[PDB]
Amino acid sequence: STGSATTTPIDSLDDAYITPVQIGTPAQTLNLDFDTGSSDLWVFSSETTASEVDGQTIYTPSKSTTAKLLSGATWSISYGDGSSSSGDVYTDTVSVGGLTVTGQAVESAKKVSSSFTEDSTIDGLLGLAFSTLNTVSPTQQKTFFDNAKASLDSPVFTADLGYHAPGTYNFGFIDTTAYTGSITYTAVSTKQGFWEWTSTGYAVGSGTFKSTSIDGIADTGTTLLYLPATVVSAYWAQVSGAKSSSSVGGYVFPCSATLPSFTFGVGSARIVIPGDYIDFGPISTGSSSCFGGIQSSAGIGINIFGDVALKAAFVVFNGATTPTLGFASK
Numbered sequence: 001s002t003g004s005a006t007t008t009p010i011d012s013l014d015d016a017y018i019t020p021v022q023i024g025t026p027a028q029t030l031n032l033d034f035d036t037g038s039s040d041l042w043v044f045s046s047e048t049t050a051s052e053v054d055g056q057t058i059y060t061p062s063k064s065t066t067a068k069l070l071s072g073a074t075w076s077i078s079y080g081d082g083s084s085s086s087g088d089v090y091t092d093t094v095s096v097g098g099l100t101v102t103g104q105a106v107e108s109a110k111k112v113s114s115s116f117t118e119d120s121t122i123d124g125l126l127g128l129a130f131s132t133l134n135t136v137s138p139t140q141q142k143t144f145f146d147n148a149k150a151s152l153d154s155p156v157f158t159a160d161l162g163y164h165a166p167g168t169y170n171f172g173f174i175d176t177t178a179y180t181g182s183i184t185y186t187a188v189s190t191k192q193g194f195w196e197w198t199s200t201g202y203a204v205g206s207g208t209f210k211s212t213s214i215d216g217i218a219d220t221g222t223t224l225l226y227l228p229a230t231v232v233s234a235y236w237a238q239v240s241g242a243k244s245s246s247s248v249g250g251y252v253f254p255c256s257a258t259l260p261s262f263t264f265g266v267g268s269a270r271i272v273i274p275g276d277y278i279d280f281g282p283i284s285t286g287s288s289s290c291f292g293g294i295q296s297s298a299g300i301g302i303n304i305f306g307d308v309a310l311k312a313a314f315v316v317f318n319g320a321t322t323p324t325l326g327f328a329s330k
């Protein structure tokens with residue numbers, strides 16, 4: 001089998017991407033944030049504290065003839081932005097773009113933190129990291145991809161995120177029309193539960209490529225590109241007026257600037273992020289100071305190839321016996 005679904009930026013800055021997902025019988029369609037950095041499929045629900053729901057579409061398990069409560073199971077997750085959610089668990093039928101998993105664990109939120117409530121466009125998350133990170137207790141549950149993998153034509157899922165435009169998540173096949181050149185595959189460590197790989201280096205704009213190993217994760221659920229302080233300083237040094245702002249929480253730059261591209265290495269291959277992809281707009285409404293899309297990982301403990309990086313590429317999440325990651329230009 002295969003599946004294919006369109007993924008769309010939630011706003012004019014590509015702050016995140018949502019993909020429609022059918023849950024239950026009859027289907028209930030929720031727009032979920034596909035997150036290769038986490039491993040829980042959780043949704044806003046009929047059980048979510050009312051004051052914490054503000055415009056999201058909810059899953060109502062009592063209206064699904066295929067929903068079954070997973071007895072005694074609870075879940076609780078926290079993310080790198082300080083947000084969190086928790087609740088109980090059902091199993092139900094989940095479909096993405098034509099691909100169906102029966103008995104998928106659907107984590108129903110009883111509580112969500114303020115940043116989830118305040119985002120009316122995201123009805124939940126669909127985790128696509130490794131199932132070892134799933135938070136369900138006392139019996140850990142598998143991701144949608146892990147459950148579907150054996151049925152797929154090929155044990156892969158691909159991310160083709162758009163810049164200011166729709167894109168595609170495919171399951172079970174590689175669309176060879178969706179990229180230029182070839183796909184370069186690179187090794188993955190699953191030991192932290194992430195799609196953790198090692199970039200071979202970087203360049204800023206038209207500058208010299210620096211060969212240097214940068215261990216990091218391919219994370220569709222993180223908006224920005226988080227890299228070592230040395231790399232980030234080298235990038236922003238090329239932008240007149242750019243500075244690291246403690247008050248704002250990262251590098252800012254004049255909104256009047258035209259940004260240089262940023263290249264990262266995948267083996268001997270190169271992915272070029274156009275400069276415009278690095279502009280995240282005014283720091284506050286009407287400001288002429290703009291927030292940068294490349295930020296230091298120093299206060300994080302891991303480098304993160306988030307959407308800024310991934311949207312410049314066609315990315316293969318290869319769940320073969322030995323998982324790997326593939327990147328192509330597009």
Ligand SMILES: Nc1ccc(F)cn1
Nearest residue numbers: 035079080081221222
């Ligand atoms: N980096 C993040 C932040 C929030 C979330 F839900 C997932 N990933």
